[PDB]
C-alpha cells in the first residue's frame, strides 16, 4: 500500500514528464465568459467548452510579455510540470496550446475562489479550520518533493477552494525539478525562505518554510513577517524572530517554531525523519492522514455555488479584448510548449 504506490507515482510522472502533452485543443473550441484574475501577463478566464458545454479556467500568457520579463524557463516549467503531475489537491490541466500571440493552459474550474479572499473577508481561521487546509499542503508537498519537484509559491492567493471545501494548489510558475540545489530568487516576499533571500542555494527546505508562514497566516489573519517597506520584511525573516498572537494554542506555536526555523539543522521536514516529523507532530494529532487523502473528511466550509459557470466567489476585473496577432511572436522560445 503506502509502499509500492510511491514508485507508481514516479513511474507515472516520469513517463508523462519525458513526453508532455502538446496542442490538445484550440481557442475557438471555447467561449470566453469572464476574467477571474489578471495574470502576469497574464489573464485567467472562465471558458465554456462547446462540444461539452463544460466549464474551465483558461490561463492566457502573452508570449512577448513573458520574454520581456524573462520567464521563458519558468513558463515552460509551469506547463511541463503541470501536465505531468497528478494528485487530489493539484489542479488538473485538461488541455494546453499556443498561437501567434499567446500561450494557453486550460484547467479545471475551482468555483470556490481563492483562500485569500475568504480569509480576508472572514478575518482568520479556527485552528481545526486552519489544520484542515494545512493537511492537504503537507500531503501535497510530500507528493511533489518525492518527485524531486519544489513548488516555491505557497500563499493563500494561489490556494483555491473547490466545491467540496477542499483545496486545489494552483500557480506553478515557480515550480521546478531540482536534484541538487537551485538559486533563483523567487516567490512572494512575505513567504521567502531566508536562504532564498541570502542566495545560499536551496531546495525542498523552502517549501516547508513557506508552510510555516501559511499556517501562521491562516490562524492569525496576518503573516509572521510584515512591515512598511519590503527590506524590513526581509530583515525580519532573516532574524526568524516571530511573535505569536495570544490565542495560538501552545501546540500551534510549537509547530510554527519548528517550521519557522532559519537554522536548517532544526527545521521540520528537513531532518532525518523528513515529513513524518510534521505529520506525527503535536498539532496534527487529530489528523488521519489517510482520510484527508481520500477526501472523506468534513470540510469546515463549503463555498456557495449557484449553477455551473458561477463567479460569485471571485473578484471583478475590467474585460479587455484578447488580441491574437496575424504575426507569430516569439516562436522559437516556446517551441517545446
Amino acid at each position: 500500500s503506502v509502499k509500492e504506490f510511491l514508485a507508481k507515482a514516479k513511474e507515472d510522472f516520469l513517463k508523462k514528464w519525458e513526453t508532455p502533452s502538446q496542442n490538445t485543443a484550440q481557442l475557438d473550441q471555447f467561449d470566453r465568459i469572464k476574467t477571474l484574475g489578471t495574470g502576469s501577463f497574464g489573464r485567467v478566464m472562465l471558458v465554456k467548452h462547446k462540444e461539452s458545454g463544460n466549464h474551465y479556467a483558461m490561463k492566457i500568457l502573452d508570449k512577448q510579455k513573458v520574454v520581456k520579463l524573462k520567464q521563458i524557463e519558468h513558463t515552460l516549467n509551469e506547463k511541463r510540470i503541470l501536465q505531468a503531475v497528478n494528485f487530489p489537491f493539484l489542479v488538473k490541466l485538461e488541455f494546453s496550446f499556443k498561437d501567434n500571440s499567446n500561450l494557453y493552459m486550460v484547467m479545471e474550474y475551482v468555483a470556490g475562489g481563492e483562500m485569500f479572499s475568504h480569509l480576508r473577508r472572514i478575518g482568520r481561521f479556527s485552528e481545526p479550520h486552519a489544520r484542515f487546509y494545512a493537511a492537504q499542503i503537507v500531503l501535497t508537498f510530500e507528493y511533489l518533493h518525492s518527485l524531486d519537484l519544489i513548488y516555491r509559491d505557497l500563499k493563500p492567493e494561489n490556494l483555491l477552494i473547490d466545491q467540496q471545501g477542499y483545496i486545489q494548489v494552483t500557480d506553478f510558475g515557480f515550480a521546478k525539478r531540482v536534484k541538487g540545489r537551485t538559486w533563483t530568487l523567487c516567490g512572494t516576499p512575505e513567504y521567502l525562505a531566508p536562504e532564498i533571500i541570502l542566495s545560499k542555494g536551496y531546495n525542498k527546505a523552502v517549501d516547508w518554510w513557506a508552510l510555516g508562514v501559511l499556517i501562521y497566516e491562516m490562524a492569525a489573519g496576518y503573516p509572521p513577517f510584515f512591515a512598511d517597506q519590503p527590506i524590513q520584511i526581509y530583515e525580519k525573516i532573516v532574524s526568524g524572530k516571530v511573535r505569536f498572537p495570544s490565542h495560538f494554542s501552545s501546540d500551534l506555536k510549537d509547530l510554527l517554531r519548528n517550521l519557522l526555523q532559519v537554522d536548517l539543522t532544526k527545521r521540520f521536514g528537513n531532518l532525518k525523519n523528513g515529513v513524518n516529523d510534521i505529520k506525527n507532530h503535536k498539532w496534527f494529532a487529530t489528523t488521519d492522514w489517510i482520510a484527508i487523502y481520500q477526501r472523506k473528511v468534513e470540510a469546515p466550509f463549503i463555498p456557495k455555488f449557484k449553477g455551473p459557470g458561477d463567479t460569485s466567489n471571485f473578484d471583478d476585473y475590467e474585460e479587455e479584448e484578447i488580441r491574437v496577432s496575424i504575426n507569430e511572436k516569439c516562436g522559437k522560445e516556446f517551441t517545446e510548449f
Binding site: 540545489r181 538559486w183 530568487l185 542566495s199 542555494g201
Partner: peptide
Amino acid sequence: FRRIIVKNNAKKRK
C-alpha cells in the same frame, strides 16, 4: 551583484 554572490556560494557548496 547576484552572479558574484551565486557563483561565489556555488564555489563554496560543491
